[PDB]
C-alpha cells in the first residue's frame, strides 16, 4: 500500500484516511484519523509514510508497515495546521498554521518542538518550498506572500491585489514560475529570477488570471511545467496552458439544472507524473481521476461517508 507503484490517498470529515488503487478504484487500506477533519495530505519524498495535517496536530501514518497507526504525532500547537510540505532530503517538514506561523520540523529527532518558527500577523493558509530547497513561500490570510530564506532568515514580503486572503501558492518543478491563488478567485503568475547558489531569487509579475468568480481553493503546476490547475468553490478544476495562460480543459461537478444548489466544492488536485491525468478531491465524498486532455472522468473513488478535502498522489522510482 506504499509498495504498489501508485500511492493515492483521500481524507476528510469522515475520520478516515483511505488508500486507493489508481487503476481500478478499489480502496486498499483505510486508517483511523479521529477527532479532526484532515486539512492536508502529503506523501514524503521518501515514500515512507504520509502526513495528515489536521486540527492542532500532524499525524503521520506508514506506507511501509502497511497496517498500524500514527508513527509520529506533532502537538502543542493551537488552531488548524493548514499546509504541509517536505524537503527532498528526508528530514525536514514545513507547516503553515492558523496560529500565524510557518514551522520547520526535524523528522530525525524527538521533540513536539520545531527546529524553527516564522511568525506573521494573519493565519497562514499555504506553505510551499522553492525547488532549490533554500526558500519557502508563505501565503497568509492578509493577502501577503512571504519568501522566507532558509539560510539568511531574511523574510521578504509581496502583496499582489490583496486586501484578499491568498489561498494557495505553488511553484513549477523548473523553478521558472510561481503561482498564487486568492479568495477573489484570482491566479497570479510570476517569472522567477534564478538568483540561486549565492541567492537573490526575485519574482517578476506576469499575468493575473480571472480564474474563478467564487473562492479559488488551490493551484498546482503539472510536473511538465506545461499546465497550471486551479481548484475552486465553483465546483471546478480549470487547467491553464503555461505558454498561453489560456484555458485548456475544465473539469466540473455542477448539477445539470440551476435549481440543484450544487452538492460539492473542488478542494484539491494532483497531476500524474507524466502530466497526463489529474486527481480531484470534492465535498461530494468522492475523488476523481480525469484525463487532462479530453476532460474525461476516467474513474470515481467512492468510499468516504463524509466530504473529501484531501489528496496525496505519488509516482516515484
Amino acid at each position: 500500500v506504499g509498495s504498489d507503484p501508485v500511492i493515492l490517498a483521500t481524507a476528510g470529515y469522515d475520520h478516515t484516511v483511505r488508500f486507493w488503487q489508481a487503476h481500478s478504484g478499489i480502496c486498499t487500506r483505510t486508517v483511523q484519523h479521529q477527532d479532526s477533519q484532515v486539512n492536508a495530505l502529503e506523501v514524503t519524498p521518501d515514500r515512507s509514510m504520509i502526513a495528515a495535517a489536521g486540527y492542532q496536530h500532524i499525524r503521520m501514518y506508514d506506507l511501509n508497515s502497511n497496517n498500524p497507526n500514527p508513527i509520529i504525532s506533532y502537538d502543542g500547537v493551537n488552531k488548524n495546521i493548514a499546509s504541509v510540505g517536505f524537503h527532498e532530503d528526508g528530514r525536514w517538514m514545513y507547516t503553515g498554521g492558523e496560529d500565524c506561523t510557518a514551522r520547520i520540523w526535524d523528522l530525525r529527532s524527538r521533540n513536539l518542538q520545531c527546529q524553527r518558527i516564522f511568525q506573521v500577523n494573519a493565519p497562514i493558509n499555504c506553505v510551499c518550498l522553492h525547488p532549490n530547497q533554500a526558500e519557502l513561500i508563505v501565503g497568509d490570510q492578509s493577502g501577503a506572500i512571504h519568501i522566507w530564506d532558509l539560510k539568511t532568515d531574511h523574510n521578504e514580503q509581496l502583496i499582489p491585489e490583496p486586501e484578499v486572503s491568498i489561498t494557495s501558492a505553488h511553484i513549477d518543478p523548473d523553478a521558472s514560475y510561481m503561482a498564487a491563488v486568492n479568495s477573489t478567485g484570482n491566479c497570479y503568475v510570476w517569472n522567477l529570477t534564478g538568483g540561486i547558489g549565492d541567492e537573490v531569487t526575485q519574482l517578476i509579475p506576469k499575468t493575473k488570471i480571472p480564474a474563478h468568480t467564487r473562492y479559488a481553493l488551490q493551484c498546482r503546476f503539472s510536473p511538465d511545467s506545461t499546465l497550471l490547475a486551479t481548484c475552486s468553490a465553483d465546483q471546478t478544476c480549470k487547467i491553464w496552458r503555461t505558454s498561453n495562460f489560456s484555458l485548456m480543459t475544465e473539469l466540473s461537478i455542477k448539477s445539470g439544472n440551476p435549481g440543484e444548489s450544487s452538492r460539492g466544492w473542488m478542494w484539491g488536485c494532483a497531476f500524474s507524473g507524466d502530466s497526463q491525468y489529474i486527481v480531484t478531491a470534492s465535498s461530494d465524498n468522492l475523488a476523481r481521476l480525469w484525463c487532462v486532455e479530453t476532460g474525461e472522468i476516467k474513474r470515481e473513488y467512492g468510499g468516504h461517508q463524509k466530504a473529501v478535502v484531501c489528496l496525496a498522489f505519488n509516482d516515484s522510482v
Binding site: Y13, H15, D35, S36, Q37, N39, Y55, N80, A82, E98, P123, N125, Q141, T167, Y215, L217, A233, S261, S262, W265, S283, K306, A307, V309
Partner: protein, 1058 residues
C-alpha cells in the same frame, strides 16, 4: 374610501414583491418604484432604484440615472460630458435643461433655450416653452416670458398659470383671477388622469396649490394696502413652519417677488439662504446673498467686506467657511468683529437701544465662530488655549444668556484641563512639576465648573451632557477648596430637578474617600430626598444593603434623613425590596447552586477551603430561622439532614479525617436529589407561602417600580397579585404582577442572579439617543426611536425588569412558524453536523462551505412570511414592516457604538402590534463579545438573512441604509453628549468589572474602550488613518455584518442562519 385605496396598493405590492422574489425583471422593477410611490413611500422606492442601478445599467446614460436620482448637479455635468462627446440629440438637451430648471439655473436655461432654436422637433418645441418661461420669469425679462407663454397652450395647467403671472405684473387682476381658477381645475382633472402612478407630482401639486393660493394673496397685496403686515406674517410663519426642499422654495419666493423686493424681505431671503447652505447648495445660497449685499461675488477678493448689512455679511462669512475659502473666512471674521465693536461703542447715540442689542448678539455669534474656527485651524495647544478662551468669554459677555456661549466656554476650560493632564501623563512616561501643574489645572478647573453650571441652567430639561460634565470635575478633583466652592455655589444656584438625570452616577460615589467631595454628595442627595423622594428610595435601599460598609452606612444616613420627612415611604420601600429579594432566589434554589459549586470544588478540584466558603453562609442564612411557610416546609424536609451534615463537616474541620467528610456528602447528595426532582415542578409561586408580607400590602404610598417622574401624577403599589409565574429557565425568573393605584396592572420580571446595573446605564444612554432622535428633524419625521424598558436593580444579584407588552422573542416566533409548518426547529444545525461532524474545528474556508450549504437547503422566508400571515390587512402588514426596518436599523448603529454583542435570537424581540424591534440583555457591551477567547463575535450587529428578508425586497438599499445614515449622522454630530454618558460608566467605580473578564491598571483598559467609541463616532473605526464619512462607514458596516466569513464563525447558538 380614501383609506380603502391604499389597502389595494399595499396588497398588490405584497404580490408584486413576491413576484420579484421569483425573478428580478426590469418589468417588475418598473411596476414597483411606481407602486411604492403611490403608497407615498419615497425612500423605500429610492432603494428600488439603487438596485435598478447596480444590476441593470439599462435605462442607460449615467445622466438618466443621476437625473432620476434627483442628483441634478451630477446629471448636469454628466449631460455636458454626454452632449460634448455626442452631438445634438433632441432629448439629451431636454434633460440638460431639466437639470437647470431644478438647480434654479435660469441664466443658463434661458440661454440654452434661445441659443438653440432650430428645434425642428415639435414636441421639443412644446416642452421647450414651459421651461423657458419660468427661466424668463426668474430673469426679470417679461417680454421673453410672454413670448414663451404665448407658446404654452391654455389647456395645460402650466399654460393657465403663467398667464396669471403676466397679468399680475402688468396689473390685470380679473384676468389673473380667472386664470387661477382655470389652472386649478386643469390640475384637479390632471390629478385623476395619472390616478396614482405619477411622480412627486401629487407632492408637487401641493407646490402648485401652495403657489396658487399665494398667488392670490399676491393679488390681495396689489390693491388692498391693509394686508401688508397680515400677508407678510403668514408668509413668514408658513416658512419657518414649512419644510419644502430648496428648489420649491425658489418658486414660492418668485411668486412673492412680484410684490416684495428682497431688500424689504431681508429676513425671508436670509432664512432661505440659511437653508440652501444647510441642505448643501452653497453656490445657490451665495447668489442669494450677493443679491442682498448688492455687492460682488466679492470679485474684488483682496478687499474688505461690506459692513452695510451686518446680518448678511455674517451669513456670507459662514457660507465662505462652509465653502472652500476658510483661512480667508477666518480672516474676515477678526476684522468684521473689530468693525462691529466700533460701530457699537461710537455710533450708538443713546436713542438706539434695539440696534445696540441685536448688534451685540450678532457679535457673540461672531466670537463663537472665531473660537470655533481657530480651534479648527490650529488644534489645541499653548498658543491657542488662551486665544479661544478669549473669544468665548467675549461671546459670554455679549449674550450673557444663550446656552451655547457658556457651554463653549466651559468645554474649552475643561479641554484645557484635559490638554495639560494628558500632556503630563506624556511627561511621566519618559516637584516643581506638580506645583505649576496644580496651578495650571486649578486655573482652568474652576472656570470650567462655573461655565458648565451657568450653561446647565440655560438648558433645563436638556442638559444631561453638561450635568455629567460637572460631575467629572466634581468627582475627579479630590477637592482643592477653590473647586469645591464653585461646586457648592452652583448646587445652590441650579435647580434640584437637574440631578435626577444623574442619580445612579452620584450613588456610585456615596462611599467617596475624598472627604470634601462626599460631604456635598450627601447634602445634595438629602435635598433631592426632600423634594421628590421615590426618585431616591429604590436606589438608596439597594445601597443600604451592601457588603461594603462605608456604602451601606452613608446610604442609611440619607434614609434616616428622609424619615424626618417621609418615614413610612422609607419603611414601605424598605420592606418591599427586602421581600422581593427573598422571593427571587428561594431557600432551596440557593442550596441547589451551592451544592453544585461545593461538589465541583471538592470532588473535581480538591478544594475544601473554597467549598466551606460556599456552604457556611447557606447554613448561617437559615440559622436565623424560617420566616415564611415556604421556608418552614423546606426546613422540615431538608433542615435536619443539613444541620447534621454540617455537624460532620465541622467534625472534619477539627479531626481532619475524610470519613467524617464523606458522611456529610452522604447527606448532601440526599437533599440534592430531592430538590432536583422538585425543581421543574416550580412553575408557579404563591404569595401566601413565599412572602406573606407582600400579600398583606394594600394601598402603599410607594410608587410602582420605575414609574415615578415629576410632571406625572405618582402611581402607587395599590396591591400585589397573589401568584407569580415561574418561567422555567436556568435562572428561573419570576413573573411578578402588580396593581396600580390608577387602576392598571404592571408586570415585572423578578430576576435572580444578574447584576442588573449595566442594563440600567444602557437604558440611560438610550433615553439620551431618544431625545437626540426626536430632535433631529429627519429622525422625528420618520419616528426613529429605541423601545426601552424599566430597570430597577434591587441588589448586586437581583432586580426588576419592565415587561414589554405584545412581545415574543425572535426565537419564539420562528419556533412557532417552524413547528406549525412541520419544519424541524434546528434544521440548519442538523444539516451542518451531518455534513461536518467536526464543524467548530474546520478552517474558515471549510466552514464557509458547510454554512452556505445549510443556508441553501433551508427557507429564508420564515420571519418575513409569518409576519404576513400575522397581519389582519395589508396596510397593517406594510406599516409594521416600515416600523420594523427602521427600528432595527436604529439599534444597529447605536448597538455598534455601544459595541453591543451577543445578539442571538432570544436577545431581541418583536412587538407584534407595531412591528418595531426591541433589544434585551446588555451584558456584552463594548468590543467585549469580540475580544473573548472561545467563539469570538466577528459581527457588529445582527443583520442576519431572515431579518434582511423581512424588510422590503431591495431592503438594504432602501429604508434600512437611509435610516442607518440618518441615525449615525445624529450620533456623530452629538458625539459629545454620547461620549459623556459612555465615559460616565466605563469609569463608573462599581461597573469596571466587565472588562477584567478579558482574563476568562484598568485605567489603561478603560481608556482604550473610550477611544474605540470615539473612533466609531469620528469615522476612525476602520482604517486608523482614513476619516470615513457616514455613508462609507455604514456601507463598511453592513458589509461586515453580512459576510458569510463573519457569520460562519458565530457560536451556533447565535444562529447565523436566522
Amino acid at each position: 374610501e380614501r383609506a380603502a385605496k391604499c389597502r389595494a396598493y399595499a396588497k398588490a405590492l405584497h404580490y408584486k414583491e413576491l413576484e420579484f422574489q421569483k425573478g428580478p425583471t426590469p418589468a417588475i422593477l418598473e411596476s414597483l418604484i411606481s407602486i411604492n410611490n403611490k403608497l407615498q413611500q419615497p425612500e423605500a422606492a429610492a432603494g428600488v432604484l439603487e438596485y435598478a442601478m447596480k444590476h441593470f445599467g439599462e435605462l442607460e446614460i449615467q445622466a438618466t440615472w443621476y437625473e432620476k436620482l434627483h442628483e441634478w448637479e451630477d446629471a448636469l455635468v454628466a449631460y455636458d460630458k454626454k452632449m460634448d462627446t455626442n452631438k445634438d440629440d433632441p432629448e439629451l438637451m431636454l434633460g440638460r435643461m431639466r437639470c437647470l430648471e431644478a438647480l434654479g439655473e435660469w441664466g443658463q436655461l434661458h440661454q440654452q433655450c434661445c441659443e438653440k432654436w432650430t428645434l425642428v422637433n415639435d414636441e421639443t418645441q412644446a416642452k421647450m416653452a414651459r421651461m423657458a418661461a419660468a427661466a424668463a420669469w426668474g430673469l426679470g425679462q417679461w417680454d421673453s416670458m410672454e413670448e414663451y407663454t404665448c407658446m404654452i397652450p391654455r389647456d395645460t395647467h402650466d399654460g393657465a398659470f403663467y398667464r396669471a403671472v403676466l397679468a399680475l405684473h402688468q396689473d390685470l387682476f380679473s384676468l389673473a383671477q380667472q386664470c387661477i381658477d382655470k389652472a386649478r381645475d386643469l390640475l384637479d382633472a390632471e390629478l385623476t388622469a395619472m390616478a396614482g402612478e405619477s411622480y412627486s407630482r401629487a407632492y408637487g401639486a401641493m407646490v402648485s396649490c401652495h403657489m396658487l393660493s399665494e398667488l392670490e394673496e399676491v393679488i390681495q397685496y396689489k390693491l388692498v394696502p391693509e394686508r401688508r403686515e397680515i400677508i407678510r406674517q403668514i408668509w413668514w410663519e408658513r416658512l419657518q413652519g414649512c419644510q419644502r426642499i430648496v428648489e420649491d422654495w425658489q418658486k414660492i419666493l418668485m411668486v412673492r417677488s412680484l410684490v416684495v423686493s428682497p431688500h424689504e424681505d431681508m429676513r425671508t431671503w436670509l432664512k432661505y439662504a440659511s437653508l440652501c447652505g444647510k441642505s448643501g447648495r452653497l453656490a445657490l445660497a451665495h447668489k442669494t446673498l450677493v443679491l442682498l449685499l448688492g455687492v460682488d461675488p466679492s470679485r474684488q477678493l483682496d478687499h474688505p467686506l461690506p459692513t452695510v448689512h451686518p446680518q448678511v455679511t455674517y451669513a456670507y462669512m459662514k457660507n465662505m467657511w462652509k465653502s472652500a475659502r476658510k483661512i480667508d473666512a477666518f480672516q474676515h471674521m477678526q476684522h468684521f468683529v473689530q468693525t462691529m465693536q466700533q460701530q457699537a461703542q461710537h455710533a450708538i447715540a443713546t436713542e438706539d437701544q434695539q440696534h445696540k442689542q441685536e448688534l451685540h448678539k450678532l457679535m457673540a455669534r461672531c466670537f463663537l465662530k472665531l473660537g470655533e474656527w481657530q480651534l479648527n485651524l490650529q488644534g489645541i495647544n499653548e498658543s491657542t488655549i488662551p486665544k479661544v478662551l478669549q473669544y468665548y468669554s467675549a461671546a459670554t459677555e455679549h449674550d450673557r444668556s444663550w446656552y451655547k456661549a457658556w457651554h463653549a466656554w466651559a468645554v474649552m476650560n475643561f479641554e484645557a484641563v484635559l490638554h495639560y493632564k494628558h500632556q503630563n501623563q506624556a511627561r511621566d512616561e519618559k516637584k516643581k512639576v506638580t506645583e505649576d501643574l496644580s496651578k495650571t489645572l486649578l486655573m482652568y478647573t474652576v472656570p470650567a465648573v462655573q461655565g458648565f453650571f451657568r450653561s446647565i441652567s440655560l438648558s433645563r430639561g436638556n442638559n444631561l451632557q453638561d450635568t455629567l460634565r460637572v460631575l467629572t470635575l466634581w468627582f475627579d478633583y479630590g477637592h482643592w477648596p477653590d473647586v469645591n466652592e464653585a461646586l457648592v455655589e452652583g448646587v445652590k444656584a441650579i435647580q434640584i430637578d437637574t440631578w435626577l438625570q444623574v442619580i445612579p452616577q452620584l450613588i456610585a460615589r456615596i462611599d467617596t474617600p475624598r472627604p470634601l467631595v462626599g460631604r456635598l454628595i450627601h447634602q445634595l442627595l438629602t435635598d433631592i430626598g426632600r423634594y421628590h423622594p421615590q426618585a431616591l428610595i429604590y436606589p438608596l435601599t439597594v445601597a443600604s444593603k451592601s457588603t461594603t460598609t462605608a456604602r451601606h452606612n452613608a446610604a442609611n444616613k440619607i434614609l434616616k434623613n428622609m424619615c424626618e420627612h417621609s418615614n413610612t415611604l422609607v419603611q414601605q420601600a424598605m420592606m418591599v425590596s427586602e421581600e422581593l429579594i427573598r422571593v427571587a432566589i428561594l431557600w432551596h434554589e440557593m442550596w441547589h447552586e451551592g451544592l453544585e459549586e461545593a461538589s465541583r470544588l471538592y470532588f473535581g478540584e480538591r478544594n475544601v477551603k473554597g467549598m466551606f466558603e460556599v456552604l457556611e453562609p447557606l447554613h448561617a442564612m437559615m440559622e436565623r430561622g424560617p420566616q415564611t411557610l415556604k421556608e418552614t416546609s423546606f426546613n422540615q424536609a431538608y433542615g435536619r439532614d443539613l444541620m447534621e451534615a454540617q455537624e460532620w463537616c465541622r467534625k472534619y474541620m477539627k479531626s481532619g479525617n475524610v470519613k467524617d467528610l464523606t458522611q456529610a456528602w452522604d447527606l448532601y447528595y440526599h437533599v440534592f436529589r430531592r430538590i432536583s426532582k422538585q425543581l421543574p415542578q416550580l412553575t408557579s409561586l404563591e404569595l401566601q407561602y413565599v412572602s406573606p408580607k407582600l400579600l398583606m400590602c394594600r394601598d402603599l404610598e410607594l410608587a410602582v417600580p420605575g414609574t415615578y417622574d415629576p410632571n406625572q401624577p405618582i402611581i402607587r403599589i395599590q396591591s400585589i397579585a397573589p401568584s407569580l409565574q415561574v418561567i422555567t429557565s436556568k435562572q428561573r425568573p419570576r413573573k411578578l404582577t402588580l396593581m396600580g393605584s390608577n387602576g392598571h396592572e404592571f408586570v415585572f420580571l423578578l430576576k435572580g442572579h444578574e447584576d442588573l446595573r449595566q442594563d440600567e446605564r444602557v437604558m440611560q444612554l438610550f433615553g439620551l439617543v431618544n431625545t437626540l432622535l426626536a430632535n433631529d428633524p429627519t429622525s422625528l419625521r420618520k419616528n426613529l426611536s429605541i423601545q426601552r424598558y424599566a430597570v430597577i436593580p434591587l441588589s448586586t444579584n437581583s432586580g426588576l425588569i419592565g415587561w414589554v407588552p405584545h412581545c415574543d422573542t425572535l426565537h419564539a416566533l420562528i419556533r412557532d412558524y417552524r413547528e406549525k409548518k412541520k419544519i424541524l426547529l434546528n434544521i440548519e444545525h442538523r444539516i451542518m453536523l451531518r455534513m461536518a461532524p467536526d464543524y467548530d474545528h474546520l478552517t474558515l474556508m471549510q466552514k464557509v462551505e458547510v454554512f452556505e450549504h445549510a443556508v441553501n437547503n433551508t427557507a429564508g422566508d420564515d420571519l418575513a412570511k409569518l409576519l404576513w400571515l400575522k397581519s389582519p390587512s395589508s396596510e397593517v402588514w406594510f406599516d409594521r414592516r416600515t416600523n420594523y426596518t427602521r427600528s432595527l436599523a436604529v439599534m444597529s448603529m447605536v448597538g455598534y457604538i455601544l459595541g453591543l454583542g451577543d445578539r442571538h435570537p432570544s436577545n431581541l424581540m418583536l412587538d407584534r402590534l407595531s412591528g418595531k424591534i426591541l433589544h434585551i440583555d446588555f451584558g456584552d457591551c463594548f468590543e467585549v463579545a469580540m475580544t473573548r477567547e472561545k467563539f469570538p463575535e466577528k459581527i457588529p450587529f445582527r443583520l442576519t438573512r431572515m431579518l434582511t428578508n423581512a424588510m422590503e425586497v431591495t431592503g438594504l438599499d432602501g429604508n434600512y441604509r437611509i435610516t442607518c445614515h440618518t441615525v449615525m449622522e445624529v450620533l456623530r454630530e452629538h458625539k459629545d453628549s454620547v461620549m459623556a454618558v459612555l465615559e460616565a460608566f466605563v469609569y463608573d467605580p462599581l461597573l469596571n468589572w466587565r472588562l477584567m473578564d478579558t482574563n476568562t491598571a484598568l485605567n489603561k483598559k478603560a481608556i482604550q474602550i473610550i477611544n474605540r467609541v470615539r473612533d466609531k463616532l469620528t469615522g476612525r473605526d476602520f482604517s486608523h488613518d482614513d476619516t470615513l464619512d457616514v455613508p462609507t462607514q455604514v456601507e463598511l458596516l453592513i458589509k461586515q455584518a453580512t459576510s458569510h466569513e463573519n457569520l460562519c464563525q458565530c457560536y451556533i447558538g447565535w444562529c447565523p442562519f436566522w
